[PDB]
Design a protein around this ligand. Structure first.
Ligand SMILES: [Mg+2]
Ligand SMILES: [Mg+2]
Ligand SMILES: [Mg+2]
Lengths: 613, 622, 706
């Protein structure tokens, strides 16, 4: 009644797996490199041959290669599930108080106290170019926002971004579509974009009226005073949101008219909510009975208008409840919608659907807007038209491979592609890096590749790691000759300022761990799953992608011992003397008095001896 | 500084702070209420609450039956089994009034499902008593033994396939003058099958017997499962249409039920009035509910049904009103000076003077003597031993919650029922009338046989309560106990085990309210257990073994290492979003063509719920 | 199958039939033949009813039809319509759910579809139903059976037979005629008869006041019970009442005050292994996994002085212990581990039989001899002692929540995060493991789990002999070094049985640096020898060996192995705290709770008292305290602790209601307190929990006034 223990014991047995009889069953060798894969035993009556799990390993490694055509056809449902998952778009996760394609993701969509917004995808492959362009622009904006002087970083990254094979600038200039992020990037690169006011997902084009912002202290439903710039006077705009459009006529803290056309229910709801929030109706302000402290990915506090926008997008019922209701006229063209966007005469107060098609404002209006430091676009008149706050937060995977040839984007790796890129960058610039290093100049540590590398070093230990690496490099340079492999391995860690202990010496380490451990570590004195080197074949295997290291090596850095650059302040001396004691822990090594001797174990079979300087 | 854990409550609500106080939902290894002493205690307690009612002798079995129903009303606040039939009937009539056609629809649906059910269905349950061997056997084993022994007696109903003929044979076997069966005897020993015979009365006692469990403390035989199935189906059909019923619910819709109940009660409060909620506990729920009341409930529910279905439904409460409790292994008497021990079985409990039992057991036996049959079994006519009629008991509770008023007073009550757990809500004008309503509900419950716990139930203004271990406070919801994943692997095969583990984590975060971080940690722990059990650590690791030696070579040879399965030393790519996709399907696109061909070889010699892709890892073990 | 059903039946019919089937069947998609039958039945019903019409007085042409369709709709509504029609037309309501209602003759109608032949299915339906309702039987082959002449005419008949012929031809030519099932099989079983034994048992299962089951049946079926509840409530005694009382702070008194009685003994340590007093002998390695015997061998080689100590210096002795037996067992374990054999078998099995006390087992005899022997009596139950608070539980809580230099947790990886919820979970896990990686409780939990795993692994065929199970662990420090830690050796006894609950004796000898005489009342269950001295950082520490004869079983071994779920328990509790915090806002508050944002400062908790004043700490300290509390709850778990934790929840919720100003009311507060207090006898965790609850309740009382 304990299957787990039974199976654990069975796997520890010799031949626990039943084996069939046939040509393929007889292709398994009796034993591989001393491992008995199949039993050479004949059962008395059953004639049942057995094998070891090592037999399955051998079959998967060297066994005959069968044909794998039509495999996707048989298991089509599972591949459809994977396709739906991969093509899906992820929104935002909200805390506090169904199609079969959604029940699959129920575990990742609905929680007891949280809810995840999820838009399923699949076979939306026609417009891959525009989708990839918008994904790239959104990622660039997100990266640049968290940086001081976002405009400079955004323009620098956007020039080094390639979608499939065409530069992002070419895609932006050609496609002409996109979203707020695409427009921001275009105006950052000096291109031209269509002229529309932006409030979240709402595109506005004034067609009559005037407004003047007045600073005021308004009270909200939750009972707090907020400083808002209110719009006074009667204004009329053409409003659009996704596939829905309409006309909004508003006045001071009041929505007069909101004519719209039938469209997607979610899109219509978003349009109506954004129109209510933009109207600045006091009826909207009074409906805020929660807490509005939403921040942005930069960590800063959203402005009050966007605070209310986010709140009411999350909690739409709180507004429709405190929005009142009325009865629409029986005109054939005119209609009305309830809180659920249905056909009901009991419609919202000030909102009305219509049958006649409303002409879109999206005429060709290519213009050259001005972009400020914080990714805000302003007309020649000085009025801000869009900003970073209006960029959609939806996330999806690009249908075309996008490559950002810049270290600033390396942070979007998996902590293994980041290491791969960083170490390949060191190897490519190894000659120049070493030439600069052998001059007493240390600005090399400030390069952007090491900036990206520091993003995976534990913040607690980053200073100590950097101090140890810098001390080891200085020892390898000044007082002794250099070892190229250790120089490459320990250079990236040098970015952070040293965090030397009170003793005036660096923290000694046996391994340097990175984010997402288990196998993400660098051995200071031995090969690692993320960085290994062959001292004789001159091969630098980074994550199993062996790269040659011919020429950059030196003849004098081969006879030298690996133990000269394994601990800061310790230089190899003597040999493996079994008189001082066992292989001392690092703890003894830091505590050792200067000039003393110690024993070390570089790896399995290479003892050495060192002396503190 | 002295660390006080309880000070966490000074900064966090107690509902959030006591989340998952128990990491399990099963019985611990130490809190085991099993033994002859516990069974005798249950019998004495059950008859204690009904000793003011009728008592007579059974004309069929000869046991001493006690009937509390329609007995005198209680005069104190002790547990009472003296439910009044008229009050139960009025509650059920009002429940039918509030839901027109619900009783009829439930009866018809249960009847149709019964007409479609097959004898094979009495094999999905837990251990069952076996009269042939007088021992607990798995449902399939007991069913097969009963079918064979019935064929021995010329009762062939299981062959027809339908469950109704099998139940007909079950109840007709009660009229046989004497029943012959196959008994397994350790005749060195060996389990040899012999043709044994018993008389009608002994067989009747065996069919009404409920053995004690050792690994619910009582188990029933196969004679009653067929009828309990239909009775519980009828009860569930009634329960799923009641807004108060909350037992069938599970997952994120349980929180929805709690929130909807709270909001509905708050909205209907009188302007300027007060709404209170009582977190309720029931005392001796199992020991104070009578099978006679359940017979009356089934009779009222199936009023308009055809008589055959009415009788079929009445059979189960009939068989549980005449039940016999087997008292277990017996006691153990030891001589300290002689260093000797011996187990006195149940038939020989009174074969020695009671002065040789400790005080508590001596008193227990003194009280048990009247109801002690001279075979090691006691008579337990009143009470519902353990969970056997959970749906029907929930129906009775919800019927109690449907009265809503007494004497047309200034209060209205509603609530949630989950069998013996419940929450009450009372709307009135002030706390005084609210407590008046709570008192009236307590008295009505007493009249119905339900005993609210005063020592465990309490009250406070609506907006915070607990239901079925789920704490609700201002919308936020927490759980007191959660069955966190056990440790190990399912043990089927390395291909299936990954699917089973990932499905377990997925269902835990769907139903049991597991969080993202907890689920990711569970994934990590399961992968650790998987790699430990199947010796399939990563190919780039430094681990020695027979299979790991070849896994390392496979790692070195393969180029698309991210496509290798975990069983092949490949990386683990499971996260929250992709717990429903087989790992072969996940890694197909990244698999090397040669490795994919070898693994997906239709002619490999190894192959010979959860979703898995057949391959060299879907092997078999003898 | 689904393709044909979609093609030959309109969407409305298919959905209605699917609903009708799903009402009674929990696996509707596993039996499409039934679906075929119901959709055909609905087609026939519509054909009968859709066309035939009527008018006001008698015209069989307005919009009044002559057929009312009760089928195809939810049964709840169907039963209401059936009862309403029967009552309105003064006719009886059939006990079944009819298919149609004929308005010309005012009769319920049942229509049947027969594969074999009509006039045979007709009589079966007559037997099932009888004179309750008329019948219309139409067969696949041209045939019909009607019980009335004024019923369906020839045109509707021709339409329905044409439909049946089309379906039959399609089934025949698409090889699905084998799947068809006659309606008879759905009705299988209506002849259910009660025997003589079951009838007599039924007659004597009726409540008081009924002679036989027929009287009860008639009484329930005919008597209107209106007014029974109020009738019985008016004549019920006033003494039956909840007796509610408005709870106040003054009602909440300290629980289990007897724990403050200084005349009682203080609780002794009774956990399986030493938690905070543990001392592990450390030996660095390269991370390579080793056999437990080899790990112990190398660790004992590194410490030869302790291993070679052959004479005992007894420091403390348990009252009933035999220091000679224990020391000889310890020496046997050391010799067995140090030997070159690949087995962990003890050499002196016969001596170990009596050293562990396994030979002192009572001899089972025949029940007859025992019955005759008047000196054999049942033993009185062991009443758990009543003990007072001991400072060692508070010290254990203080020490186990601190950070150490070693971490025993190394968990595998998971796929990359792509969804925001996954990023939330990853961030939460990052903070949790950062705060918990080097907690002492983590290493203690891993030691417990590994020890119980070793105990269970050695029960395959080694339950009939004496083994030595090293108490081992593997840890890693911040510098990346890996150590094997040996905390002692345990000899695992032998149970001749294999019942999964038979007691197996484990004699544990654990290293420690704690003088047992400093806290005398903590160690009455242990016999302690001073086995040597150790140097750690130039400081000499005495090394004692705590020896104890404990017992366990396979279930307890599995439970101790499961003890690793305290990690998931703490993760879930932290998640619940963070989710409660983020419900007030609309976004995840993990970073704000842990590190603090620009708007939200880092969250702080009250972690204890220093000299009677509240002391605050970060969320990491609170996390460590939560983990330690979970670990101690698991280690000290028993019936008393389970009862205490299940019962004090109600008091805590009452206190929460008092704090929230929800105006709690209680019916039996003294009953609550007695139920809580009956569990405070000798469990150290329960007694310390009562102490902590009393202290925190005093603090809450004081803070309520302000
Ligand atoms: Mg319950
Ligand atoms: Mg409750
Ligand atoms: Mg029908």
């Amino acid at each position: 009644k304990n299957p787990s223990l039974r199976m654990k014991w069975a796997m520890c047995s010799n031949f626990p797996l039943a084996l069939t009889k046939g040509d393929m069953a007889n292709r398994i060798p009796l034993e591989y490199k001393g491992i008995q894969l199949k039993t050479n035993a004949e059962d008395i009556g059953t004639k049942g041959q057995m094998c070891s799990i090592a037999a399955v390993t051998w079959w998967n490694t060297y066994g005959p290669i069968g044909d794998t055509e039509g495999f996707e056809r048989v298991y089509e449902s599972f591949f459809l599930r994977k396709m739906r998952l991969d093509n899906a778009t992820w929104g935002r996760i909200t805390f506090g108080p169904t199609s079969a394609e959604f029940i699959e993701m129920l575990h990742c969509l609905q929680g007891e106290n949280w809810r995840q917004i999820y838009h399923p995808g699949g076979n939306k492959l026609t417009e891959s170019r525009s989708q990839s362009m918008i994904v790239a622009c959104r990622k660039i904006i997100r990266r640049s926002i968290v940086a001081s002087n976002p405009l400079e970083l955004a323009v620098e990254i956007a020039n080094k971004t390639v979608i499939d094979t065409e530069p992002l600038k070419s895609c932006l200039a050609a496609i002409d579509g996109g979203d707020v992020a695409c427009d921001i990037i275009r105006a950052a690169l000096g291109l031209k974009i269509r002229q529309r006011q932006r409030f979240g997902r709402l595109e506005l084009k004034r067609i009559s009226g005037r407004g003047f912002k007045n600073d005021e202290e308004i009270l909200i439903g939750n009972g707090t005073i907020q400083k808002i710039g209110i719009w006074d006077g009667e204004e009329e705009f053409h409003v659009r949101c996704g596939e829905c459009r309409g006309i909004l006529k508003k006045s001071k803290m009041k929505l007069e008219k909101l004519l719209i056309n039938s469209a997607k229910k979610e899109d219509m709801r978003d349009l109506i909510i954004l129109c209510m929030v933009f109207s600045q109706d006091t009826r909207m302000f009074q409906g805020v009975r929660g807490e509005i402290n939403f921040l942005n990915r930069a960590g800063q506090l959203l402005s009050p208008m966007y605070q209310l926008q986010r709140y009411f997008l999350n909690r739409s019922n709180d507004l429709f409840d405190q929005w009142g209701y009325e009865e629409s006229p029986k005109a054939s063209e005119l209609h009305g919608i309830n809180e659920s966007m249905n056909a009901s005469d009991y419609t919202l107060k000030g909102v009305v659907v219509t049958r006649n098609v409303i002409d879109d404002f999206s005429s060709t209006e290519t213009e050259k807007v001005s972009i400020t430091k914080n990714l805000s676009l302003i007309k020649r008149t000085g009025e801000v038209i869009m900003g970073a706050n209006d960029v959609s937060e939806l996330e999806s995977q690009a249908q075309l491979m996008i490559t950002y040839d810049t270290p600033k984007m390396w942070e979007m790796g998996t902590t293994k592609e980041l290491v791969q890129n960083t170490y390949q960058w060191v190897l490519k610039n190894l000659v120049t890096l070493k030439a600069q290093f052998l001059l007493g100049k240390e600005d090399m540590f400030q390069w952007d590749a090491f900036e990206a590398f520091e993003s995976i070093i534990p913040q607690k230990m980053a200073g100590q790691y950097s101090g140890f690496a810098r001390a080891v490099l200085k020892q390898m340079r000044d007082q002794e000759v250099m070892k190229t492999d250790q120089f490459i391995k320990l250079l990236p860690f040098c970015f952070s300022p040293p965090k030397l202990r009170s003793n005036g010496e660096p923290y000694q380490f046996l391994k340097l761990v990175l984010k997402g451990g288990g196998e993400n570590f660098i051995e200071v004195r031995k090969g690692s799953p993320l960085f290994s080197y062959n001292p004789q074949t001159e091969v630098l295997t980074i994550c199993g992608r062996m790269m040659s290291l011919k020429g950059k090596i030196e003849d004098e850095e081969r006879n030298r011992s690996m133990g000269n650059a394994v601990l800061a302040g310790f230089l190899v001396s003597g040999k493996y003397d079994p008189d001082l004691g066992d292989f001392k822990t690092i703890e003894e090594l830091e505590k050792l008095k200067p000039g003393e001797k110690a024993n070390i174990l570089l790896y399995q079979g290479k003892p050495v001896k060192v002396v503190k300087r | 500084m002295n660390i006080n854990p309880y000070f966490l409550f000074i900064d966090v609500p107690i509902q959030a702070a006591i989340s998952t106080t128990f990491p399990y939902t099963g019985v611990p290894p130490y809190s085991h209420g099993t033994g002859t002493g516990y069974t005798i205690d249950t019998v004495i307690r059950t008859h204690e609450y009904s000793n003011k009612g009728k008592q007579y002798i059974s004309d069929v079995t000869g046991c001493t039956m006690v009937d509390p129903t329609n007995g005198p009303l209680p005069e104190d606040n002790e547990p009472s089994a003296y439910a009044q039939l008229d009050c139960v009937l009025e509650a059920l009539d009002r429940m039918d009034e509030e839901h027109p056609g619900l009783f009829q629809a439930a009866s018809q649906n249960a009847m149709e499902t019964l007409m479609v059910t097959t004898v094979d269905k009495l094999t999905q349950g837990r251990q069952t008593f076996d009269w042939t061997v007088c021992r607990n056997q798995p449902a399939a084993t007991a069913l097969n033994t009963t079918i064979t022994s019935f064929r021995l007696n010329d009762l062939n109903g299981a062959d027809k396939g339908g469950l109704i003929p099998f139940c007909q044979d079950i109840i007709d076997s009660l009229d046989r003058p004497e029943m012959t069966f196959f008994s397994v005897k350790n005749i060195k020993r060996i389990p040899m099958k012999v043709k044994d015979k018993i008389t009608k009365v002994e067989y009747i006692k065996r069919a009404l017997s409920l053995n004690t469990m050792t690994k619910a403390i009582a188990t029933a035989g196969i004679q009653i499962r067929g009828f309990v199935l239909v009775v519980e189906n009828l009860a569930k059909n009634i329960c799923e249409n009641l807004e108060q019923s909350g037992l069938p619910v599970g997952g994120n819709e349980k929180k929805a039920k709690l929130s909807n109940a709270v909001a509905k009660m708050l909205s209907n409060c009188p302007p300027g009035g007060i709404s209170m909620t009582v977190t309720g506990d029931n005392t001796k729920w199992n020991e104070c509910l009578n099978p006679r009341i359940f017979l009356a409930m089934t009779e009222r529910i199936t009023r308009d049904s055809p008589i055959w279905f009415r009788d079929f439904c009445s059979i189960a409460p009939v068989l549980f009103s005449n039940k016999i409790a087997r008292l277990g292994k017996g006691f153990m008497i030891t001589s300290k000076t002689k260093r000797l021990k011996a187990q006195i079985p149940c038939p020989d409990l009174f074969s020695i003077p009671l002065e040789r039992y400790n005080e508590e057991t001596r008193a227990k036996l003194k009280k048990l003597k009247p109801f002690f049959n001279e075979e090691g079994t006691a008579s337990l006519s009143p009470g519902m031993m353990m969970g056997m009629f959970n749906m029907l008991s929930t129906v009775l509770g919800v019927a109690a919650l449907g009265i809503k008023n007494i004497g047309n007073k200034e209060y209205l009550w509603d609530g949630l029922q989950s069998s013996d757990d419940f929450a009450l809500f009372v709307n009135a004008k002030d706390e005084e009338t609210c407590m008046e309503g709570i008192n009236d509900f307590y008295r009505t419950c007493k009249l119905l046989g339900i005993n609210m716990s005063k020592k465990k139930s309490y009250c406070n203004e609506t907006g915070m309560f607990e239901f079925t271990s789920m704490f609700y406070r201002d919308g936020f919801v927490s759980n007191f106990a959660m069955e966190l994943p056990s440790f190990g692997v399912a043990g089927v095969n390395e291909s299936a085990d990954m699917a089973i583990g990932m499905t377990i984590i997925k269902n835990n975060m769907i139903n049991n309210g597991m969080g993202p971080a907890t689920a990711q940690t569970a994934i990590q722990l399961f992968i650790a257990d998987y790699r430990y059990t199947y010796k399939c650590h990563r190919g780039d690791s430094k681990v020695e073994g027979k299979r790991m030696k070849i896994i390392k070579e496979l790692w070195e040879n393969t180029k698309g290492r991210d496509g290798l399965l975990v069983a092949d030393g490949g990386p683990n790519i499971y996260n929250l979003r992709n717990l429903h996709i087989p790992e072969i399907v996940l890694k197909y696109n990244l698999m090397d063509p040669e490795y994919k061909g070898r693994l997906l070889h239709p002619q490999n010699p190894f192959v010979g719920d959860y979703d898995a892709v057949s391959g060299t890892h879907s092997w078999r073990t003898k | 199958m689904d393709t044909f059903i979609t093609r030959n039946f309109q969407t409305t019919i298919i959905q209605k039939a699917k609903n009708t089937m799903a009402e009674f069947s929990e696996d509707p998609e596993l039996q499409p033949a039934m679906l075929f039958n119901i959709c055909v039945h609905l087609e026939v019903c519509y054909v009968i009813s859709d066309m035939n019409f009527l008018d006001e007085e008698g015209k069989a042409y307005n919009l009044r039809p002559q057929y009312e369709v009760i089928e195809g709709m939810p049964r709840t509504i169907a039963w209401m319509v059936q009862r309403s029609l029967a009552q309105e037309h003064g006719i009886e309501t059939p006990k079944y759910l009819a298919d149609l209602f004929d308005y010309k003759t005012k009769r319920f109608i049942e229509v049947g579809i027969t594969k074999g032949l009509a006039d045979d299915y007709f009589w079966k339906k007559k037997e099932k139903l009888g004179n309750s309702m008329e019948l219309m039987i139409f067969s696949y082959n041209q045939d019909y059976s009607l019980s009335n002449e004024s019923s369906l005419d020839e045109e509707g008949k021709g339409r329905v037979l044409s439909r049946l012929t089309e379906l039959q031809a399609e089934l025949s030519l698409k090889n699905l005629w084998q799947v068809l099932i006659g309606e008879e099989d759905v009705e299988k079983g209506i002849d259910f008869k009660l025997g003589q034994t079951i009838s007599r048992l039924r007659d004597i299962s009726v409540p008081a006041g009924f002679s036989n089951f027929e009287g009860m049946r008639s009484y329930i079926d005919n008597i209107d019970p209106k007014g029974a509840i109020e009738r019985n409530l008016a004549r019920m005694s006033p003494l039956v009442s909840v007796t509610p009382k408005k709870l106040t702070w003054e009602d909440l008194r300290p629980i289990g005050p007897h724990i403050y009685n200084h005349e009682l003994p203080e609780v002794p340590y009774n956990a399986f292994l030493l938690m905070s007093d543990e001392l592990g002998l450390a030996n660095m390695t390269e991370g390579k996994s080793k056999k437990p015997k080899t790990l112990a061998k190398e660790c004992l080689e590194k410490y030869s002085t302790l291993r070679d100590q052959t004479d005992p210096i007894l420091i403390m002795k348990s009252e009933k212990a035999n220091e000679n037996f224990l020391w000889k067992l310890w020496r046997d374990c050391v010799n067995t581990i140090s030997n070159e054999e690949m087995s962990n078998e003890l050499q002196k099995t016969n001596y170990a039989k009596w050293a562990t006390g396994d030979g002192l087992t009572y001899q089972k005899i025949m029940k007859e001899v025992a019955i005759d022997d008047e000196t054999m009596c049942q033993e009185e139950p062991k009443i758990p002692n009543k003990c007072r608070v001991a400072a060692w539980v508070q010290t254990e809580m203080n020490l186990l929540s601190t950070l150490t230099s070693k971490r025993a947790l190394d968990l595998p990886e998971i796929g990359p995060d792509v969804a925001p919820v996954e990023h939330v979970g990853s961030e939460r896990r990052k903070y949790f493991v950062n705060e918990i990686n080097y907690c002492k409780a983590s290493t203690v939990m891993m030691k417990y789990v590994l020890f119980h795993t070793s105990l269970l692994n050695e029960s395959n065929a080694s339950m009939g002999k004496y083994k030595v199970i090293p108490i081992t662990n593997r840890v890693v420090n911040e510098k990346g070094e890996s150590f094997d830690m040996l905390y002692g050796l345990a000899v695992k006894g032998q149970s001749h049985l294999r019942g999964d609950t038979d007691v197996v004796t484990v004699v544990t000898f654990e290293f420690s640096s704690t003088d047992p005489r400093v806290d005398s009342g903590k160690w009455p269950k242990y016999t302690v020898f001073r086995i040597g001295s150790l140097f750690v950082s130039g400081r000499e520490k005495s090394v004692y060996l705590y020896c104890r004869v404990n017992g366990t079983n396979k279930i307890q071994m599995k439970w101790g192995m499961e003890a690793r779920r305290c990690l998931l328990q703490s993760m879930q509790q932290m998640e619940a705290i963070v989710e409660q915090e983020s419900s007030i806002q609309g976004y995840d508050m993990t970073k704000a709770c842990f590190k603090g944002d620009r708007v939200n400062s880092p969250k702080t908790f009250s972690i204890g008292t220093q000299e009677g004043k509240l002391v605050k700490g970060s969320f990491g300290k609170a996390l460590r305290v939560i983990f330690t509390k979970c670990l101690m709850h698991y280690v000290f778990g028993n019936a008393q602790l389970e009862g205490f934790s299940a019962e004090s929840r109600r008091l805590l919720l009452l206190i929460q209601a008092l704090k929230d100003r929800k105006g709690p009311w209680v019916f039996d507060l003294e009953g609550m307190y007695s139920g809580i207090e009956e569990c405070i006898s000798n469990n150290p965790w329960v007694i310390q929990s009562a102490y902590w609850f009393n202290e925190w309740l005093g603090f809450e009382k004081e803070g309520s006034k302000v």
